[PDB]
Amino acid sequence: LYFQGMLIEIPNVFSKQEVSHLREQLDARRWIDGNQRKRNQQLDKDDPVAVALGQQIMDRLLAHPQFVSAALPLQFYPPLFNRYQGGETFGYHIDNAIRSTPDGMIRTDLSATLFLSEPENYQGGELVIQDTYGQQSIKLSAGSLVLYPSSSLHQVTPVLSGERTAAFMWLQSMVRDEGQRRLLFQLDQSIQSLTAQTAAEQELFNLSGVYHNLLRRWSEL
């Protein structure tokens, strides 16, 4: 779990075997073209395999304690499967703050990309994110996830060779403010480390009480 700047990497969300089973199912579906500057391919949002596998990705992420701690998810925009090859790219843009989903409107606090192609198997296709804190290129291993704020100016550089398949999504967090969400995450991770280091049980409970209190003060459901 790497906390490189403003963005967080969750490695091995799915295994290499699970990624292959995901790809065998996804590759069989009908990849539709589009320009919605952008030129790439996607599975239709209502494709039943896309819907089913997107639910599997959400279930898996919701079963990951570090993901849950870092993002405190309230509601996901259902995963969207995308593909970039032969010069396909998504130019610099800012994501909209509000997005319409099948179960109402959500505030896009965080964006997330699950990689379904190995980085060595495609030239280009880097996810470049740019903020007031800085700039980074992201091209993680198949099964790994990058979680980043939706406010970032970003792009997917052209894939000049091979192909890049990934699941993309947005999510509304229970904690709106990034500063508050990072403080909670910091406190939770200290509690986890102290638990692993066998610290006094009374202090683990006291700190967990502080955490509970802050989450109760700052959450918006």
Between 18 and 95, name the residue whose CB sits nearer to Ni ion.
95
Burial class (CB in 10 A: 0-12, 13-18, 19+), 61: buried
Q: Is 1 in the site for a second copy (CB under 8 A)?
A: no
* Separation of alpha carbons 84 and 42, rounded Å: 9
Give me the least distance between CB of 37 and a second copy, in Å please: 12
| 95 labelled binding-site residue | yes
Give me the least distance between CB of 93 and Ni ion, in Å please: 6
For residue 159 the two structure tokens come to 């894939």
Site residues for a second copy, 65-94, by CB under 8 A, read 74, 92, 94
DSSP string, 145-188: EEEEETTSEEEE--EEEEEEEEEEEEEEES---HHHHHHHHHHH
Give me the least distance between CB of 32 and a second copy, in Å please: 23
Give me the least distance between CB of 83 and Ni ion, in Å please: 15
Q: Which listed option, Ni ion, a second copy, none, makes contact with residue 108 (CB within 5 to 8 Å by class)? A: a second copy
For residue 188 the two structure tokens come to 């939770």
For residue 134 the two structure tokens come to 């800085």
**Binding residue numbers for 2-oxoglutarate:** 164
Residues in contact with a second copy by the rule CB under 8 A: 2-6, 74, 92, 94-98, 104-109, 130-134, 150-151, 153, 174, 176-179, 182-183, 185-187, 189-190, 193-195, 197, 199-200, 202-217, 219, 221
